[PDB]
Amino acid sequence: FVNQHLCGSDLVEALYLVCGERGFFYTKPT
């Protein structure tokens, strides 16, 4: 697989590219 550095911002955009259509869990509201 290919990927260079993944943190929150980059982990979310890739997460979705990863999750495809499934949502994810990064932060919660309040």
Partner 1 sequence: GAVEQCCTSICSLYQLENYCN
Q: Supply the minimum distance, in Å, between the C-beta of residue 17 and partner 1.
A: 9
d(CA 4, CA 25): 21
Q: Supply the minimum distance, in Å, between the C-beta of residue 2 and partner 1.
A: 9
What size, in residues, is the chain? Answer: 30
Residues 1-30 that bind partner 1 (CB under 8 A): 1, 3-8, 10-11, 14-15, 18-19, 22-26
14: CB partners within 8 A, 6+ apart: 3, 6
DSSP 26: S
Residue ranges in contact with partner 1 by CB under 8 A = 1, 3-8, 10-11, 14-15, 18-19, 22-26
